[PDB]
Design a protein around this ligand. Structure first.
Ligand SMILES: NC(=O)c1ccc(SC(F)(F)F)cc1
Lengths: 274, 274
């Protein structure tokens, strides 16, 4: 009942009421010597995508080098060379909606022509506002993530909701329809460990804006800060964050460990009555 | 702030505010040919206890054959022969509070003399009311679990709270102090799969009775019913139930997989601000 529309992802449709949707994380393994497109690079990407599809992923999230976790300085002409061949191949042989992980307008634009269905922006359309227009033009869902270039909060949650609505304004002024807007609390970004725990504890507040919320906490540093555990041993901590996130009404979770998280989400959904 | 007393377990003290307490499950591996006490049986019990202590367990729960999951018909004279040597050895070389898993008064009584600190009753003092007196006499914490011999609920939750308070009455009429009372929703017992999901979803209601709540969902059938997964693949489902349980204010979780659940509980505590 909570949502009265389905997420329209070109040729795939995502119901927001039946279950928590699992977005699986695919990071490029760049080939040295080449700028992209090579067989090993692309085929490792496809095999990874297929594994995630089998493990219960509903969306595949595809990131280049300029995005997380790398954040390397690459121009858009090269990032296209790399990210486009992956999107052409994955979209061809894995029938799932694909989101492009970029804050760059031209990269988002190429990705969608290559065959991406959703835009996923870590800067909430603030780094390159034209990205909002790209989304409006192609009529695709855009994920707006909370992020700032500083740590200076008067009031964390109120500041987050304010910051986010600034993103919504930019998106809607560009012509993006409400149904194509998704929000993300930006856990792990521009927050102290203490502020990350705080945002998690108060996540249900994001619900007042009236948009589906995607949660992305997978293997993040704050989990390590709490448990005192390296990145490879953060499965149980990520699981907690996913369970809490779902209890507090999130519609997507973005995770590396698709099998495990998928199982937890399904148990949560059964319990909270999704 | 929520609790203004500590759980007094003889020589160990359990703070109910700092963190979710993990009770690790130890089931006897009975030796054929002997009635109990043999070296392999007892030493496997000790090694298991030590493993759980290292994995982060705060309490060791020790069950004989007449209790779960076996429920075999054994007299109390034999159950004592088996459960007492385990309790003497574990209490000797694992410095943790030990709970005896029994609904039988004489068994509880022997267990405590042998060195058990807490009584854990799956029948909520209704099967053998004298167990309440045993607890009152020795001044030990008693866990009262919801259980009935039928499935006939007018209103699940109201019926559960009613049933439980009937247990509290029997306990207090025997002389058990409020601080020595703990409650358990009896998930997996006398409930359909649908009713188990319901009790989980409405667990916070148990809080109104004003007693610490222990949650025990580890590897239970309903998790299997939801995920469609055999008992060995229920880690992720148990994890969900533990996370939800903690969100809804439970003070203990009783689990087989101490390492994993301990990590999840610790992440939950950090998030909900315990
Ligand atoms: N490979 C495993 O047995 C394993 C270990 C830990 C986890 S984390 C959990 F259970 F989801 F919370 C999952 C699977």
């Amino acid at each position: 009942m909570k949502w009265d529309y389905d997420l329209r992802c070109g040729e795939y449709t995502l119901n927001l009421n039946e279950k928590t949707l699992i977005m699986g994380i695919l990071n490029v393994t760049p080939d040295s010597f080449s700028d992209g497109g090579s067989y090993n690079e692309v085929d490792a990407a496809v095999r990874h995508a297929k594994e995630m599809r089998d493990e219960g992923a509903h969306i595949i999230d595809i990131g280049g080098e300029s995005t997380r976790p790398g954040f390397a300085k690459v121009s858009v002409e090269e990032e296209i060379k790399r990210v486009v061949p992956m999107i052409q191949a994955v979209s061809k042989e894995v029938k799932l909606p694909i989101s492009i992980d970029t804050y760059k307008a031209e990269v988002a634009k190429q990705a969608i022509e290559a065959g991406a269905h959703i835009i996923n922006d870590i800067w909430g359309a603030k780094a390159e506002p034209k990205i909002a227009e790209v989304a409006a033009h192609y009529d695709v869902p855009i994920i707006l993530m909370h992020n700032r270039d500083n740590m200076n909060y008067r009031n964390l949650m109120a500041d987050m909701i304010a910051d986010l609505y600034d993103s919504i304004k930019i998106a809607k002024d560009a012509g993006v329809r409400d149904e194509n807007i998704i929000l993300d609390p930006g856990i792990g970004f521009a927050k102290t460990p203490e502020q990350n725990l705080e945002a998690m504890r108060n996540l249900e507040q994001l619900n007042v804006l009236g948009y589906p919320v995607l949660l992305g906490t997978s293997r993040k540093s704050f989990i390590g800060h709490v448990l005192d555990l390296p990145v490879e041993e953060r499965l149980e901590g990520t699981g907690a964050t996913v369970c809490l996130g779902i209890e507090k009404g999130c519609e997507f979770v973005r995770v590396h460990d698709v099998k495990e998280m998928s199982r937890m989400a399904k148990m949560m959904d059964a319990m909270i009555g999704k």
